[PDB]
Design a protein around this ligand. Structure first.
Ligand code: NA
Ligand code: NA
Length: 321
DNA sequence: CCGACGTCGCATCAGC
DNA sequence: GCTGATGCGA
DNA sequence: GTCGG
């Protein structure tokens, strides 16, 4: 419908983030693309688009040029710019952000082939990113996520039967494919007021599900994993997996949040204000008359939170908005 | 006109 | 060596 | 770049 326009805007968004280092303009272009992607008519003028929340003057001007000519002069130029297109491209490697990519490109390093010739100039994280460059840009079909979940719930339970683990993200909401796996972990010995994460990571490296580590501390693990290769069949791609340990009395707040979607969370947080509650990723708190937040309220399920705000429990499946 | 635009854990850097 | 800033991804 | 106090 408006694929032309939203690829244009998404492409422009990337140059802002990666080359210009203008994070807010990146987010403006993305938000403009989203609204346009949802617009159920083929757009005829920038004026038509400007009416949508997140489309201003400059993007209207650009939509008009694209409609009249089928291209954007600035984008054509940017796209053919040797420096910018390389900087933009290197940020596709996980761990190479806009600043490292600018440095690489300053000293001549432009391509994966170049990154490969200069491993010693990469931190740990960036090497992993480079190694799994193709695998990381693949999506993960739901089927494989169920298999991955099977493994993670098994090996958690097998470390200590009292752990609670939940695979969140769009997967929890029923999505047909995911970008990564987001695992939220908790245990009744850990509240707000030991080795609980290391032990679980250890078990998953021990049965060869976890294959690499990006980062790991007391509360959050970022790394890589892979389903076991079925007899003589082709090996599965390597996948991104995060695991976070969350205090028991903040866990359901964490699950609700990390399940999303972003839009859904936005609605609920708003609805929660007008009902006198502040909900962050951690806690739900009451708001006194002058706007001052009281003690985090006890939460023992996702549902407890909905109750607090006089809303009816909605399944992850329908938390689309 | 002009500031907000999310916030934070971890790894690694810059400064002392 | 320690502490805070910054880059990064989410 | 867009919005809104
Ligand atoms: Na507008
Ligand atoms: Na990157």
């Amino acid at each position: 419908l408006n694929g032309g326009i939203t690829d244009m805007l998404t492409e422009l968004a990337n140059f802002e983030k990666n080359v210009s280092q203008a994070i807010h303009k990146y987010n403006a272009y993305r938000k403009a693309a989203s609204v346009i992607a949802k617009y159920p008519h083929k757009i005829k003028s920038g004026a038509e688009a400007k009416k949508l929340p997140g489309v201003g003057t400059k993007i209207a001007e650009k939509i008009d040029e694209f409609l009249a000519t089928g291209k954007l002069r600035k984008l054509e130029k940017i796209r053919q710019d040797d420096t910018s297109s390389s900087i933009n491209f290197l940020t596709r490697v996980s761990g190479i952000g806009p600043s490292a990519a600018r440095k690489f490109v300053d000293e001549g390093i432009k391509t994966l082939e170049d990154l490969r010739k200069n491993e010693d100039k990469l931190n740990h994280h960036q090497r992993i990113g480079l190694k799994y460059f193709g695998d990381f840009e693949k999506r993960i079909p739901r089927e494989e996520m169920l298999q991955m979940q099977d493994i993670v719930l098994n090996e958690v339970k097998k470390v200590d039967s009292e752990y609670i683990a939940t695979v969140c993200g769009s997967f929890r909401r029923g999505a047909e494919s995911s970008g990564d796996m987001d695992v939220l972990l908790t245990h009744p010995s850990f509240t707000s007021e030991p080795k609980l994460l290391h032990q679980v990571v250890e078990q998953l490296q021990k049965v060869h599900f976890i294959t690499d580590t990006l980062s790991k501390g007391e509360t959050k693990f970022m790394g890589v994993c892979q389903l076991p290769s079925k007899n003589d069949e082709k090996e599965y791609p390597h996948r991104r997996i995060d695991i976070r340990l969350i205090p028991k009395d903040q866990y359901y707040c964490g699950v609700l949040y990390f399940t999303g979607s972003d839009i859904f969370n936005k609605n609920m947080r708003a609805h929660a204000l007008e009902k006198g509650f502040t909900i962050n990723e951690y806690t739900i708190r009451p708001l006194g008359v002058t706007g001052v937040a009281g003690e985090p309220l006890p939460v023992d399920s996702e549902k407890d939170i909905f109750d607090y705000i006089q809303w009816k429990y909605r399944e992850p499946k329908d938390r689309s908005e």
